[PDB]
Amino acid sequence: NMSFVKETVDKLLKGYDIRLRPDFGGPPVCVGMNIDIASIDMVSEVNMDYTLTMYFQQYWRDKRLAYSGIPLNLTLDNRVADQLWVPDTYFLNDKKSFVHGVTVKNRMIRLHPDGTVLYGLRITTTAACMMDLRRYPLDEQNCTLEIESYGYTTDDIEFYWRGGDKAVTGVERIELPQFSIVEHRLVSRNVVFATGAYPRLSLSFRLKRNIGYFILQTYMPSILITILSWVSFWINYDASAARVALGITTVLTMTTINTHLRETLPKIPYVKAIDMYLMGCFVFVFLALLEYAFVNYIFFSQPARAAAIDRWSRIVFPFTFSLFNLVYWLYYV
Amino acid sequence: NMSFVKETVDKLLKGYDIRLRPDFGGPPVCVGMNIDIASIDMVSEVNMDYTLTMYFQQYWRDKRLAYSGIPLNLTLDNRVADQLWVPDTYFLNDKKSFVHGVTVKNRMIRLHPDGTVLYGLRITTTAACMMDLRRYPLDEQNCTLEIESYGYTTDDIEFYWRGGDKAVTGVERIELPQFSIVEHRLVSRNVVFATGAYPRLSLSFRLKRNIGYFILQTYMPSILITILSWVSFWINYDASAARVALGITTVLTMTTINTHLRETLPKIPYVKAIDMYLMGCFVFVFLALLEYAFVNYIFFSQPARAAAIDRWSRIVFPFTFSLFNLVYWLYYV
């Protein structure tokens, strides 16, 4: 009978004051939280942030909403959330978040006979994640979502992960183009500001980069360009136009690779290991072109020595480049 | 007791005229400001602005909200902020700002028995910072945030920094990849417009650009090509093929470098320091080629004077280039 339910609901909201928290002036109200991750869209090094879509559920108790005579959970229209008290929960490290609103505002209010309120939202949030790129491409990142009460201190509100470590679900079926989620972690603490101590929850992920993306995008092209640069040592030094064109083309294409990689990462003043590797590849192609110039200069005097320089280079360049790659890859160990 | 507190708050808001400021028609009301900086997300030279996230707290006294008998500071739900008078504070140089609204509008209202109101907001603002890049990439910037009353003159409202120099915190949290905060400064003043005099607070930051090998690698190609152009002076006139090859190589490489740097440097359509440096290098290689042409012209008439001209150029060109570099690095540093 909907008439009885309407009478009950109208009675509950009769004289209800939304400006006062449950048990105002007494012990803190305890809010339990669940998160169901639906996706982690775009981890960005350039912007130092990531996007996250989730179902965010909050659980508290308000004795002003206890009802009797109806043995049911009352799922109410979500606009009822505007007539009740809700926690002022927010994400400290976010930059732009919204609550989905098609076809209606993605919100859920469910009441239970003992006064317990379940309040659910569907949120897409972009959250900051500062990254350490000194070990690119073998770097490992740690990205967090920080959850805090904006206005109420620990004397008025309390947070806990509802369900222990089983509070956050859906993490194990997240696929990223470049990373893999090695681990996630749940933490609870108190954080002190000039206005007092506030409860805090933290959900952290550890991301590990897949080297298959750095390869096939930056490494394989560099190796191919260096091989093409070496090719010129097998042509007679009479063919000046061919060798000059080959050297210039290799230099310009290696410069393109360097600039492209530098643009895919944020601009920082210092020099990383990967920058050293790309500079080494550039040095190798430029040294091949310069060796041709040196052979051409010395050809007028001792053509036999001019040919011997090419013969020696045919062996020296591949060997030294292989040793350089080995040294670079053993730097990371 | 929640009912007693509800009736007290109802009495507070009973007959409360929100349209009138505190002490309307009398002395001005003093509002103290606090800012806690979360981050400075980005600093754009092309758009000439920077993005700032902050907790902005305002402190004032309203005698209409004084209450007695409750020895507590009442933290009210942020929706109550719509039933209270708040200052019409605005930022003069902001271009696009918003208050974060997940999961609720990040707003805080705290009352004290004396009638004192604390009002806190979490705000992201894209503030305009007109930059002088005539010394790029070794420029120093000064980016400000201006805080002002819009509708109330100094006969109605007063502004001050609460705590003095300790009114702004979190400058250590600012982590710009490309800049480094040198200093921050707090200013209080009055600004006169055609409608009267208004209070003004001003928070300014001094920024220094970080210099690295990547800043260094913009001058090195030009310097190397200039030295290559010098090299031609040591070649005998009989081997003019080498001299002309050096001339054409240097001129083409220099022009290509200049056009590429125009393409890659940030699109700022006025003269900077590096533009003049590149122009000077181009002038030097052009002068070297012109000197070769003059020597080739006078060769058949004054071979001894031609050799003397080459020998004197061998010293003059590096000397004048060192002089040009010295003048440049003393004027722009």
Epitope: N93, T144, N190, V191, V192 | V171, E172, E175, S180, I181
Partner: nanobody, 105 residues
Framework: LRLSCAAS????????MGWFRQAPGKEREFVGA????????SYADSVKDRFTISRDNAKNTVYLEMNNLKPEDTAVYYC??????????????????WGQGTQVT
């Protein structure tokens, strides 16, 4: 008198090192704090313009240089690390990893 605090490990997650001193009959008191990267510094009023804080990443170490010592400085000194989103800078509770008590007279 110069104090050294050498921090090793995941120092990127904890970008701020702070210094505290505890009196024999009082609680821990903030002295100063330095950012790992920018070197930005903050000091207490009682120690401002007397103490200085510096750091170097060559061995991941921070330094507190004490000048114009007073009998009021007799306290056991600690060095602590603070996370990126841990709130206020002047509160010992926000600091996760703590050093070893050093006696200064």
């Amino acid at each position: 008198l110069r104090l050294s605090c050498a921090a090793s490990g995941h120092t990127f997650n904890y970008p701020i090192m702070g210094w505290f001193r505890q009196a024999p009959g009082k609680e821990r008191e903030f002295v100063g704090a330095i950012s790992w990267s920018g070197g930005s510094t903050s000091y207490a009023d009682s120690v401002k313009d007397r103490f200085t804080i510096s750091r170097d990443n060559a061995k991941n170490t921070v330094y507190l240089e004490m000048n114009n010592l007073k009998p009021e400085d007799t306290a056991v000194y600690y060095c602590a690390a603070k996370g990126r989103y841990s709130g206020g800078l002047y509160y010992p509770t926000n600091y996760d990893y703590w050093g070893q008590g050093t006696q200064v007279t």
